[PDB]
Ligand binder design. Structure first.
Ligand code: NA
Ligand code: NA
Lengths: 383, 379
């Protein structure tokens, strides 16, 4: 069930899209620590940002603001629909804050009985009791005692189902624009637009979990920009910090008033995230992501031409899913481990789907080399 | 707060205007080794050049090293690392619930906690937290959490049964007026947990990592918990946390000696641990407390403001007399004006949580500034 690295695979060093273990074995990284290291390992600009801020100031309590946090808040506010930004340490915490805010906004602006949260099967929002209960895998929320109530799950991309359970007692709809863990499934524009319209009709808040698909991952800064559907609340993490734990909850003044346009934020985390933002939010990187996706997809199609293993290639930008044909159902972990043995680090998205989330600046030579290693791994699994 | 800190070094902090402050607050007991400690900066820089991040699929050398250090120095046999104390608390509470579920009964779900407790602001942790005002208004809270007064062993006895999975307690309630547990209370909780087969959970996010003069508060009391949480001081300002428990308990999870841990975080926390867990630092804490307390007594001798000085080691509470009840914020703001950063613990209590290696010169200067602030509020 879970993927655990063996005792002879402990990462010790990373540089760009390359990782070395304790035995000095080199790997090409198409996993990014699960879409976290969006600028690769020990990127010079991020290392510089960490070092200079690390000489100056690391920490301030929630009582104070700081220059890195204010700078990052301003950048996010300028680049998005947001008017207010709250910083935490992780996407889980950001989601906690978003869900709590949606609940509290409904409580004070409308009714204390307006508590229903609508989420989707296969969703992943974190492992805290609240976020795992909003998440759509019962296996992970069972066995921890009474779960926070008034959370309803319906299938992803099923607008009819949402209409059926949505009413004036609904406070929030929570959705990943692309379900990364749940098979790399993208929302249809109809579905997402419908959620926006239903939330408007019922005065509920539309919450986008973009912890995985955000911060350039899709080729747009956020996935909502691709769809042209504006959420009420957005959460971001993982890539935001490039490997440093940091997260952000984005919303409007009107919504945030329910609780300088910024709250919290570790000085060191925000300095690093600012450097990450400055690189990712450029025409060069964002437009390069589409080129790179095409390069990965070409290799995946070539492997499929040789070995015939995939039924679907999907996702957006450098979040790539490759669904295994029915003859290879449940074999995703085996392809992953074979990949590792061949010196390439990949992901799963359930037992039937291969997932790739490499650095957004991954070099062409690394794309080529890693995919040749993955091709070799595939051969060992099927032939 | 009407100023923005831009730079810190040891126990001194500068704002945007270049005004210099003495830091007796430590970002709320987080910067246990002061700002930009050279050993912590060096660890950050060195690991920052090597590897920052691994997913939970992998371990890493800093995580393993930090795990070994915590395992060797405490009751723990297993360590799970997260980013924050709130997250570590989520993990501890979930583990206590799940252990009870799979080892005893799915109906064994009651968590006992205490009034004025703080355990974080996630829905679950704030519900276990003992401040109803902060858990109200977020929709249905997770159920089966009972609160009773801190230090009220009779009350614990009354609500505890075989359906109880956990007792969660801060050995010293930091936020709740800097109230220390009595030895009888903590031993009582241990005995009751043994009797009803519940897990004793120590939230040592604030009172842990050297704060009391021992590495963890449970060592002062000689009462061993089943699960302990640690953050704040653990990373000296870098966000990192740990949940410590035994192999028997940890086995309830669906993996070696450690789980998770950011390589950069764990490298910094390792350097922090190596410094704090020394006779020099730990013994130095008692001497520094005495100096702080003597200053507080001198201030009281002059101004007659305090009714009580409490806490342990370098977590210090000073309770205001009824004449000054509800005015802790006023002394806080006056302190800031006078150039000293302090804390509150409710509107009735002044709190201090300075660097564990705070220089004597800084103790005297900061306390003199606080005396000036006290003098201002009085006049
Ligand atoms: Na904006
Ligand atoms: Na031990």
């Amino acid at each position: 069930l879970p993927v655990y690295a063996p005792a002879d695979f402990i990462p010790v060093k990373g540089k760009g899209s390359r990782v070395w273990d304790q035995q000095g074995k080199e790997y090409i990284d198409f996993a990014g620590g699960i879409a976290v290291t969006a600028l690769g390992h020990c990127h010079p600009a991020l290392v510089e940002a960490l070092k200079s801020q690390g000489e100056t100031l690391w920490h301030t309590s929630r009582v104070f603001t700081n220059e890195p946090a204010l700078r990052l808040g301003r950048k996010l506010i300028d680049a998005t629909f947001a008017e207010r930004v709250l910083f935490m340490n992780s996407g889980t915490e950001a989601n906690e804050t978003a869900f709590k805010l949606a609940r509290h906004y409904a409580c004070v602006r409308h009714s204390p009985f307006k508590t229903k949260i609508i989420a989707f099967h296969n969703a992943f929002h974190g492992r805290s009791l609240f976020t795992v209960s909003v998440g759509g895998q019962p296996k992970y929320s069972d066995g921890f005692g009474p779960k926070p109530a008034d959370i309803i799950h319906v299938p992803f991309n099923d607008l009819h189902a949402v209409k059926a359970v949505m009413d004036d007692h609904t406070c929030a709809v929570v959705v990943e624009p692309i379900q990364g863990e749940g098979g790399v499934q993208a929302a249809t524009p109809e579905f997402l637009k419908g959620l926006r319209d239903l939330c408007d009709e019922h005065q509920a808040l539309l919450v986008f979990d973009e912890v995985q698909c955000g911060m350039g991952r899709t080729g747009d800064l956020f996935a909502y920009m691709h769809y042209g559907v504006t959420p009420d609340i957005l959460t971001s993490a993982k890539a935001l910090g490039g490997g440093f734990p940091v997260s952000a909850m984005l919303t409007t003044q009107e919504i945030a008033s329910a609780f300088g346009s910024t709250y919290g934020g570790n000085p060191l985390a925000c300095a690093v995230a600012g450097a990450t933002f400055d690189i990712i939010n450029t025409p060069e990187v964002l437009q390069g992501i589409h080129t790179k996706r095409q390069q990965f997809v070409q290799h995946l199609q070539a492997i499929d031409e040789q070995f015939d293993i995939f039924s679907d290639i999907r996702g957006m930008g450098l979040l790539i899913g490759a669904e295994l044909k029915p003859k290879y159902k449940g074999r995703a972990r085996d392809f992953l481990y074979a990949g590792a043995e061949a010196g390439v680090m990949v992901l799963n998205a359930g037992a039937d789907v291969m997932r790739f989330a490499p650095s957004l600046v991954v070099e062409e030579a690394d794309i080529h080399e890693g995919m040749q290693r993955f091709a070799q791994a595939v051969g060992k699994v099927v032939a």
